[PDB]
Amino acid sequence: GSTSTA
């Protein structure tokens, strides 16, 4: 899994 924010 992955979680990315910007």
Side-chain angles (χ1 to χ4, degrees):
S2 70
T3 306
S4 302
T5 64

